[PDB]
Amino acid sequence: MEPPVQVAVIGSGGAAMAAALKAVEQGAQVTLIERGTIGGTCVNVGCVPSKIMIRAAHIAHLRRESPFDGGIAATVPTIDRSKLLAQQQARVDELRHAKYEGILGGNPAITVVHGEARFKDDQSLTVRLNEGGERVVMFDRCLVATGASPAVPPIPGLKESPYWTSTEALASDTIPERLAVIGSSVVALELAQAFARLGSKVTVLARNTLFFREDPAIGEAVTAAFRAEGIEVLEHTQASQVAHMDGEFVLTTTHGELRADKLLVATGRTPNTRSLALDAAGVTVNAQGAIVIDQGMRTSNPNIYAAGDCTDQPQFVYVAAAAGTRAAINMTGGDAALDLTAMPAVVFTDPQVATVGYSEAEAHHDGIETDSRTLTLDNVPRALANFDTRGFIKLVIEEGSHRLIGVQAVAPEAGELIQTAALAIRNRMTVQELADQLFPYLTMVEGLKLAAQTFNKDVKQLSCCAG
Amino acid sequence: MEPPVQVAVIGSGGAAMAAALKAVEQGAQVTLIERGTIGGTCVNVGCVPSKIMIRAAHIAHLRRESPFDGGIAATVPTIDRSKLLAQQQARVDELRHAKYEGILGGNPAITVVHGEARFKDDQSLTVRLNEGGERVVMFDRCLVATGASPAVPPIPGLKESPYWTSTEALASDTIPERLAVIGSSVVALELAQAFARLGSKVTVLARNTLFFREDPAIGEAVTAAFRAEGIEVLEHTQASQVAHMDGEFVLTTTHGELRADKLLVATGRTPNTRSLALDAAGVTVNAQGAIVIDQGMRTSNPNIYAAGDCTDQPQFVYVAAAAGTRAAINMTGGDAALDLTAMPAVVFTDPQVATVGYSEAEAHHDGIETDSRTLTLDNVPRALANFDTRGFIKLVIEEGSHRLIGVQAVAPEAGELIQTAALAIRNRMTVQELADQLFPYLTMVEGLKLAAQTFNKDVKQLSCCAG
Ligand SMILES: Cc1cc2nc3c(=O)[nH]c(=O)nc-3n(C[C@H](O)[C@H](O)[C@H](O)COP(=O)(O)OP(=O)(O)OC[C@H]3O[C@@H](n4cnc5c(N)ncnc54)[C@H](O)[C@@H]3O)c2cc1C
Ligand SMILES: Cc1cc2nc3c(=O)[nH]c(=O)nc-3n(C[C@H](O)[C@H](O)[C@H](O)COP(=O)(O)OP(=O)(O)OC[C@H]3O[C@@H](n4cnc5c(N)ncnc54)[C@H](O)[C@@H]3O)c2cc1C
């Protein structure tokens, strides 16, 4: 008789969870090692708490102002952050148990180890247990899903100051009167707007422009939206010195001296691979410290796989989870590959930013001839009925075939409409085909149809005679 | 040389507008006859003003209460309906000019006639001009796009009372202290909730249950939502007598006497065909007075077509417009057909109701073997982060092929997510295929993926290990 394959999984986030359970489903015995709180980033200090805080911020914002204030009185709502934090944390704790702890526990095929793991060789790990001492974990196959951590730049004086990373910001029980934010990452912007809406006077220090690595139209729309609601966005600005004196932060910048009660550093994230002793297992990493893998999540060592934020993969929990599931399949004798061709991405600012497929620049870089159309939101019925036309919907197609290969949008509910675009791309639809489909009038997603029609029709024909 | 085809179009709503412009594009000369305001129903007294009022109502509602009131103070906002009405009307007037008047005017190929048309024979119309007198309009082909009007039941005393139809309700400059609503139609419910949120004490008299003709789960969720915010829903209730005494309505019902300041009658709509003298042109209508047509919008008379609410077609402006465009193609020698297989439908209540494709009952009626899954919103991350789990997402598939053939949902933003379902159905995707696609975490549309996964996975595996 054959013994169950011994699978070791380092981490307990989205990638590790998906892998652990898939491995067990495929008949393997799993030993999962986690050094901190079970659940990793998303449920504890990532997606979940941040989206909850953003929703609370949205309510506070709408109680403060709206496009209908001429007929509906508005007020400055009193905010009790302690109560909001308690509500937020209760849901986080509830989900951690329901989707992580409760599933890992009570399963004789899964052994959870509380400690920090490192490779001993390519078939075993050495674990420094949280309760002291060590333990060796032998394995046939191992999945590294250690995620990433907030990056902290070597700005003089920052290291020893009481600054915040996204974790401390989300866990704060008070809304600071003044919040300075260093960075222009998605995390930086989502938190910047949430705190602003909850009461903070926010100043964002962007080294370049917002969404510098994305299509330029995106950063322009978001920057204008932030400024419109009192958020200061200092472009091409960096702090050369950080100091904390007399109970406040003092930042020396290229724009002058800036003072704030709290400082959020959200420049980016780095892979958690330095404590893994990857060299002992022959696992190669790139210049950024990320573990190199192929579409099957296989590393340079045939018996070791990697998935999630500790690799070069896009940093989204749904990508990490999909990768973990497929890595487990391959660790158990299968043959699976991760396809990210129609991977959507959403930024939970207001308006939201959403993208899928190729941007014009990205297509060109890959030698693809394209054409595009950019429809401003003042052409979308839903936006007009809401009296909020900030934003746009951009479609990118391949020349000749007219196949839709990319969509970028800045608009309320962009995250919802982007999935229609994702399916259109997945099914290799042309813009003509998308435009000929029936869409509900007065929905934001109708904007996709309207934009598609502009490839063969005039903007003046939309919502009238563009069929 | 050949002369331009003479096309007559009766009406100026979505169907007529799309047809008129398509006909001209195809080389025809158009004579469009309209007895009332240009633009018809949607822009003037339908979709546009109603969605604007609903958005205003949403803001008022959120300023009054939210799932985050434990940490964000709320207040009863003062409402100035005169100001809201002015804003609403200005957008309506703006859109009427931009998408209707400005496009019809200044075009030598289009002649707009202000009057009421009726058939003289199958090649001409007699028009009673609004300014007096008549005119004959000869045509080679004619499109009837006369729409429908609010139905008014023969309830004793109703006829002579100062009741409202959706038109008077949308045009009211005051929010009534008490509003009674007779009917359970989409129009009745959308307006009922809007007025309630803007300040009225609303009572809905439904002859049966809400969404009686739809899947039962829909009516149950909507009824619970209405009651949750103070809207009284009297099921299986009809008014046997209407009276207006001492400045108020007095309704005798099976539930007892009900008094209200205003009365909205929104039971349904009837086709505008009684004044057309259709018999003079040999155009057949059904028992409801609707004009009978085929998929090419052709009537019993080869030279006359019909599209929109005056036919048996679904009453949506996007359906009317699509039909008008295709009718114009056929009137000008083409061969087009309207495909409604993936037609989405949205109800702008909160939560919204959205459907596409077959419901279980509808599939069975057509001899299709099916299976389904109903995912309650407390299983959708976005709903949980919003602390509002009222609703559900239901998927209907064909047995054997596992092809998705229908989706019904009750949830915030259901109108946005339903389009993803529409494209999935259009592309004949199976639930497994839909479930294997990447969806953004914490978006309502992710609910489609989660529901799809329940066809092969347990609800406890969702957002964890259902891959
Ligand atoms: C503020 C914020 C907001 C975000 N918003 C979104 C969003 O809206 N949508 C989205 O899809 N993604 C979002 N993300 C990103 C998403 O959270 C991550 O991509 C995802 O959680 C990564 O999952 P993972 O399994 O790769 O890693 P992780 O969940 O980060 O976990 C790795 C785990 O391994 C442990 N570990 C590390 N080294 C060792 C070791 N040597 N031994 C034992 N255990 C070790 C860690 O302690 C941790 O528990 C957000 C992130 C943040 C920080
Ligand atoms: C309150 C309300 C809310 C709605 N919400 C939505 C929604 O959210 N989404 C959606 O898609 N649909 C919605 N609808 C329905 C949508 O408005 C209609 O289906 C659509 O407007 C019908 O277009 P049509 O061109 O067929 O007719 P219409 O736009 O109704 O116009 C027919 C025109 O012909 C004229 N006419 C009639 N008889 C004659 C004659 N003998 N001679 C000359 N002119 C004549 C009329 O006066 C009118 O201008 C709503 C309707 C109402 C009333």
Side-chain angles (χ1 to χ4, degrees), chain B residues 272-301:
Chain B
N272 296 324
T273 60
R274 322 193 98 170
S275 299
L276 290 175
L278 295 173
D279 282 348
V283 179
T284 302
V285 298
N286 60 26
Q288 292 69 59
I291 297 175
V292 181
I293 57 165
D294 62 8
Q295 291 190 60
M297 276 56 71
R298 318 169 187 293
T299 67
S300 51
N301 185 292

Short mmCIF file of all heavy atoms in Angstrom, two decimals, chain B residues 272-301:
data_model
loop_
_atom_site.label_atom_id
_atom_site.label_comp_id
_atom_site.label_asym_id
_atom_site.label_seq_id
_atom_site.Cartn_x
_atom_site.Cartn_y
_atom_site.Cartn_z
N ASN B 272 -51.03 51.99 -26.27
CA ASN B 272 -51.74 53.12 -26.88
C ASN B 272 -52.10 52.80 -28.33
O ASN B 272 -51.42 53.24 -29.26
CB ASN B 272 -50.86 54.38 -26.83
CG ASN B 272 -50.56 54.84 -25.41
OD1 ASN B 272 -51.41 54.73 -24.53
ND2 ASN B 272 -49.36 55.36 -25.19
N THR B 273 -53.17 52.04 -28.51
CA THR B 273 -53.57 51.63 -29.86
C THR B 273 -55.03 51.91 -30.22
O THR B 273 -55.42 51.74 -31.37
CB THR B 273 -53.33 50.13 -30.06
OG1 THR B 273 -54.10 49.40 -29.10
CG2 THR B 273 -51.85 49.79 -29.87
N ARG B 274 -55.82 52.34 -29.25
CA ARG B 274 -57.24 52.59 -29.50
C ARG B 274 -57.55 53.74 -30.47
O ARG B 274 -58.58 53.71 -31.15
CB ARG B 274 -57.95 52.84 -28.17
CG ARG B 274 -57.43 51.95 -27.05
CD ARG B 274 -58.32 51.94 -25.82
NE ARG B 274 -59.20 50.78 -25.80
CZ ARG B 274 -59.94 50.41 -24.76
NH1 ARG B 274 -59.91 51.12 -23.64
NH2 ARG B 274 -60.71 49.33 -24.83
N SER B 275 -56.67 54.73 -30.55
CA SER B 275 -56.90 55.87 -31.44
C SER B 275 -56.18 55.75 -32.78
O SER B 275 -56.13 56.72 -33.54
CB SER B 275 -56.44 57.16 -30.75
OG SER B 275 -57.17 57.41 -29.57
N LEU B 276 -55.65 54.57 -33.08
CA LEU B 276 -54.90 54.36 -34.32
C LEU B 276 -55.69 53.88 -35.53
O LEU B 276 -55.17 53.92 -36.65
CB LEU B 276 -53.75 53.39 -34.08
CG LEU B 276 -52.58 53.89 -33.22
CD1 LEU B 276 -51.60 52.75 -33.00
CD2 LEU B 276 -51.90 55.06 -33.90
N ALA B 277 -56.92 53.43 -35.33
CA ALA B 277 -57.73 52.92 -36.44
C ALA B 277 -56.93 51.85 -37.17
O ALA B 277 -56.83 51.86 -38.39
CB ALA B 277 -58.08 54.06 -37.39
N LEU B 278 -56.35 50.93 -36.40
CA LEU B 278 -55.54 49.86 -36.96
C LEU B 278 -56.30 48.97 -37.93
O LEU B 278 -55.70 48.37 -38.83
CB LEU B 278 -54.95 49.01 -35.82
CG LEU B 278 -53.96 49.74 -34.92
CD1 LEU B 278 -53.58 48.87 -33.74
CD2 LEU B 278 -52.72 50.11 -35.72
N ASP B 279 -57.61 48.88 -37.77
CA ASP B 279 -58.43 48.06 -38.66
C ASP B 279 -58.41 48.61 -40.08
O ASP B 279 -58.55 47.85 -41.04
CB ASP B 279 -59.87 48.00 -38.15
CG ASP B 279 -60.03 47.02 -36.99
OD1 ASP B 279 -59.10 46.24 -36.74
OD2 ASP B 279 -61.10 47.04 -36.34
N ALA B 280 -58.23 49.92 -40.21
CA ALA B 280 -58.19 50.57 -41.52
C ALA B 280 -56.91 50.22 -42.28
O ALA B 280 -56.84 50.41 -43.50
CB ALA B 280 -58.29 52.08 -41.36
N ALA B 281 -55.91 49.71 -41.57
CA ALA B 281 -54.64 49.34 -42.19
C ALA B 281 -54.41 47.84 -42.12
O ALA B 281 -53.35 47.35 -42.51
CB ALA B 281 -53.49 50.09 -41.52
N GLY B 282 -55.39 47.11 -41.60
CA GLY B 282 -55.27 45.67 -41.50
C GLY B 282 -54.19 45.21 -40.53
O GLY B 282 -53.51 44.21 -40.79
N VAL B 283 -54.04 45.93 -39.43
CA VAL B 283 -53.05 45.59 -38.41
C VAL B 283 -53.74 44.90 -37.23
O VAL B 283 -54.60 45.49 -36.57
CB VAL B 283 -52.32 46.84 -37.89
CG1 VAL B 283 -51.32 46.46 -36.82
CG2 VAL B 283 -51.62 47.54 -39.05
N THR B 284 -53.35 43.66 -36.97
CA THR B 284 -53.94 42.87 -35.90
C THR B 284 -53.35 43.13 -34.51
O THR B 284 -52.14 43.31 -34.37
CB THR B 284 -53.80 41.36 -36.20
OG1 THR B 284 -54.44 41.07 -37.45
CG2 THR B 284 -54.44 40.53 -35.09
N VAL B 285 -54.21 43.14 -33.50
CA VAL B 285 -53.80 43.34 -32.12
C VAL B 285 -54.29 42.14 -31.32
O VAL B 285 -55.17 41.41 -31.77
CB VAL B 285 -54.42 44.62 -31.51
CG1 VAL B 285 -53.95 45.83 -32.29
CG2 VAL B 285 -55.93 44.52 -31.53
N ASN B 286 -53.72 41.92 -30.13
CA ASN B 286 -54.15 40.80 -29.31
C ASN B 286 -55.24 41.22 -28.34
O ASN B 286 -55.77 42.33 -28.42
CB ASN B 286 -52.97 40.17 -28.55
CG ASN B 286 -52.27 41.15 -27.62
OD1 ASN B 286 -52.87 42.12 -27.15
ND2 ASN B 286 -51.00 40.89 -27.34
N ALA B 287 -55.58 40.33 -27.41
CA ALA B 287 -56.63 40.59 -26.43
C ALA B 287 -56.36 41.81 -25.54
O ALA B 287 -57.30 42.43 -25.04
CB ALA B 287 -56.85 39.35 -25.56
N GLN B 288 -55.09 42.15 -25.35
CA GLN B 288 -54.72 43.29 -24.51
C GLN B 288 -54.63 44.60 -25.30
O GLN B 288 -54.35 45.65 -24.73
CB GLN B 288 -53.39 43.03 -23.80
CG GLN B 288 -53.44 41.94 -22.74
CD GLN B 288 -53.62 40.56 -23.33
OE1 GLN B 288 -52.82 40.11 -24.14
NE2 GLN B 288 -54.69 39.88 -22.92
N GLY B 289 -54.84 44.52 -26.61
CA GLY B 289 -54.77 45.71 -27.43
C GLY B 289 -53.38 45.98 -27.97
O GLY B 289 -53.15 46.99 -28.63
N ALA B 290 -52.45 45.07 -27.69
CA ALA B 290 -51.07 45.21 -28.15
C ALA B 290 -50.97 44.77 -29.60
O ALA B 290 -51.66 43.84 -30.03
CB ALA B 290 -50.15 44.36 -27.28
N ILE B 291 -50.11 45.43 -30.37
CA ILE B 291 -49.93 45.09 -31.78
C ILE B 291 -49.08 43.83 -31.92
O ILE B 291 -47.99 43.73 -31.35
CB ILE B 291 -49.25 46.25 -32.55
CG1 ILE B 291 -50.16 47.48 -32.51
CG2 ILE B 291 -48.96 45.83 -33.99
CD1 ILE B 291 -49.55 48.73 -33.13
N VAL B 292 -49.59 42.86 -32.67
CA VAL B 292 -48.89 41.61 -32.89
C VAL B 292 -47.78 41.77 -33.91
O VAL B 292 -47.99 42.32 -34.99
CB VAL B 292 -49.87 40.51 -33.37
CG1 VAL B 292 -49.12 39.20 -33.57
CG2 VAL B 292 -51.00 40.35 -32.37
N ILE B 293 -46.59 41.28 -33.58
CA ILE B 293 -45.43 41.37 -34.47
C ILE B 293 -44.57 40.12 -34.38
O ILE B 293 -44.70 39.33 -33.45
CB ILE B 293 -44.53 42.58 -34.10
CG1 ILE B 293 -44.09 42.48 -32.64
CG2 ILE B 293 -45.27 43.89 -34.36
CD1 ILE B 293 -42.93 43.38 -32.27
N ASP B 294 -43.68 39.94 -35.36
CA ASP B 294 -42.77 38.80 -35.36
C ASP B 294 -41.41 39.31 -34.89
O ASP B 294 -41.28 40.49 -34.54
CB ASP B 294 -42.68 38.18 -36.76
CG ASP B 294 -42.13 39.14 -37.81
OD1 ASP B 294 -41.67 40.24 -37.44
OD2 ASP B 294 -42.15 38.78 -39.00
N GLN B 295 -40.39 38.45 -34.89
CA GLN B 295 -39.07 38.87 -34.44
C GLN B 295 -38.46 39.99 -35.27
O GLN B 295 -37.45 40.58 -34.87
CB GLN B 295 -38.11 37.67 -34.42
CG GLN B 295 -38.44 36.66 -33.33
CD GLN B 295 -37.35 35.62 -33.16
OE1 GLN B 295 -36.20 35.95 -32.86
NE2 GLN B 295 -37.70 34.35 -33.36
N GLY B 296 -39.08 40.29 -36.41
CA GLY B 296 -38.59 41.36 -37.26
C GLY B 296 -39.45 42.61 -37.12
O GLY B 296 -39.34 43.54 -37.92
N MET B 297 -40.31 42.61 -36.10
CA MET B 297 -41.23 43.72 -35.81
C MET B 297 -42.28 43.95 -36.89
O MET B 297 -42.89 45.01 -36.95
CB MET B 297 -40.44 45.01 -35.58
CG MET B 297 -39.92 45.19 -34.14
SD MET B 297 -38.89 43.83 -33.55
CE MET B 297 -37.43 44.08 -34.54
N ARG B 298 -42.52 42.94 -37.72
CA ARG B 298 -43.50 43.04 -38.80
C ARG B 298 -44.91 42.74 -38.29
O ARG B 298 -45.11 41.76 -37.56
CB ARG B 298 -43.15 42.05 -39.92
CG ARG B 298 -41.67 41.96 -40.26
CD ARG B 298 -41.41 40.77 -41.18
NE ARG B 298 -39.98 40.53 -41.41
CZ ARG B 298 -39.18 41.35 -42.09
NH1 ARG B 298 -39.66 42.47 -42.61
NH2 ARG B 298 -37.90 41.04 -42.26
N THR B 299 -45.89 43.56 -38.67
CA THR B 299 -47.28 43.34 -38.26
C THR B 299 -47.97 42.49 -39.32
O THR B 299 -47.33 41.99 -40.24
CB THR B 299 -48.08 44.65 -38.13
OG1 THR B 299 -48.25 45.24 -39.42
CG2 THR B 299 -47.37 45.63 -37.21
N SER B 300 -49.29 42.33 -39.18
CA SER B 300 -50.07 41.55 -40.13
C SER B 300 -50.09 42.20 -41.51
O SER B 300 -50.45 41.57 -42.50
CB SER B 300 -51.49 41.35 -39.61
OG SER B 300 -52.08 42.58 -39.22
N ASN B 301 -49.72 43.48 -41.56
CA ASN B 301 -49.66 44.20 -42.83
C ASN B 301 -48.18 44.33 -43.16
O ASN B 301 -47.42 44.92 -42.40
CB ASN B 301 -50.30 45.58 -42.72
CG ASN B 301 -50.36 46.30 -44.05
OD1 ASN B 301 -49.33 46.68 -44.61
ND2 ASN B 301 -51.56 46.47 -44.58
#
